[PDB]
């Protein structure tokens, strides 16, 4: 099964970066999307990338994030910008490959 390693982290008093790389089938995933996982409460998606470049987002973060592929490391680029610090949450990135759904390990980030 495709393994997924992620990135990100830190703590500052507006911008930060988060990209997860798949273990195999580089460029072998149609829909990829990160979900937000806030404490206690359940999990929910934040942004999507199709297999080819278009990017719908969640209304909660329109314009606030840029999501973009990078076949160089199979690291779709979930970019955190102008963060409202309350929006912190463990972040796991998903992969829908060959009809099967593969989950990341989750990552938590906060600033301010």
Partner 1 sequence: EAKIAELQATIERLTSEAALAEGALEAARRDRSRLQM
Partner 2 sequence: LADSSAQQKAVERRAGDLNVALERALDRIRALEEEADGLRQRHAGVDTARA
Provide the token pair at 110.
Answer: 């906060």
| Interatomic CA distance for residues 108 and 92, integer angstroms | 9
CA distance 89 to 109: 7
24 binds, among partner 1, partner 2, none (CB under 5 to 8 A by kind): none
84 binds, options partner 1, partner 2, none, Cβ within 5 to 8 A by partner type = none
- Minimum CB–partner distance for residue 4 and partner 2 (Å): 15
User: Is residue 42 at the binding interface for partner 2, with CB under 8 A as the rule?
Assistant: no
Number of Cβ within 10 Å of residue 105's Cβ equals 13
Tell me the residue length of the chain. 112
Beta-ladder partners of 109: 89
Query: Is residue 2 at the binding interface for partner 1, with CB under 8 A as the rule?
Result: no
Sign of the Cα torsion 19, 20, 23, 26 reads negative
Residues in contact with partner 1, counted by CB under 8 A, come to a total of 23
Please identify, among the stretches 10-18, 39-47, 73-81, 104-112, the one whose residues bind partner 1 according to the rule CB under 8 A: 39-47
Interface residue list for partner 1 (CB under 8 A): 30-31, 41-42, 44-45, 47-48, 50-52, 54, 56-60, 62, 96, 98-101
Name the residues that contact partner 2, by CB under 8 A: 59, 62-63, 98-101
């Amino acid at each position: 099964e495709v393994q997924l390693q992620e990135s990100g982290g830190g703590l500052v008093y507006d911008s930060l970066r988060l990209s997860c790389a798949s273990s195999r089938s580089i460029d072998g995933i149609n829909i990829m999307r990160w979900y937000r996982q806030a404490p206690g409460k359940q999990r929910g998606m934040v942004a999507v990338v199709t297999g080819w470049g278009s990017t719908n987002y969640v209304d909660s973060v329109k314009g606030r994030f840029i999501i973009s592929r990078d076949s160089a490391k199979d690291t779709v680029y979930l970019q955190m910008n102008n963060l409202k610090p309350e929006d912190t949450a463990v972040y796991s990135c998903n992969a829908i490959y060959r009809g099967s759904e593969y989950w990341g390990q989750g990552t938590q980030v906060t600033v301010s």
